[PDB]
Nucleic acid binder design. Sequence first.
RNA 1: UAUGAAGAAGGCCUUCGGGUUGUAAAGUACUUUCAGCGGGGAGGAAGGGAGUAAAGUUAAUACCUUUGCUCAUUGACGUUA
Length: 83
Amino acid sequence: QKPAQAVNRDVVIGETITVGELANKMAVKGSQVIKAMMKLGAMATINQVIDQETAQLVAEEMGHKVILRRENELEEAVMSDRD
RNA sequence: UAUGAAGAAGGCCUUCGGGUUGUAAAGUACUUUCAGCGGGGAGGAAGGGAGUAAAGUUAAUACCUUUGCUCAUUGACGUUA
Ligand SMILES: [K+]
Ligand SMILES: [Mg+2]
Ligand SMILES: [Mg+2]
Ligand SMILES: [Mg+2]
Ligand SMILES: [Mg+2]
């Protein structure tokens, strides 16, 4: 019952994230390969911090399921209910 | 909820041989309490009103009183329980 499925788990991302937490938040197989993935795509470092849109771009590169959460939703829900 | 050892990745500790997070997760079967969407549906209502009957009262079959029977009705809660 063990297929060869690659990492495809759902991952929630915040507004501003960094490499150190991103290492285990996605749990990708290439522990350093994940680190090189950013350093290759654009100028980036060990401690570099990316944004939620850039984080969505990253998750697209990894291909795992992506979830975007931002704090402004509270205003959006109120706006939606308006008649 | 039951099953679930590739005792998986990733983390951490490592006497780098391993241990642990751990049946935990993933996968495979089973169920829908509550919320959500529709349908149905108690109890809180006792009464009061209109006729009609008989008893009681009187000059009086009237009017009034006591007891029936019959008819239509009384809920903010409330889209109730
Ligand atoms: K391990
Ligand atoms: Mg319900
Ligand atoms: Mg009753
Ligand atoms: Mg009732
Ligand atoms: Mg009498």
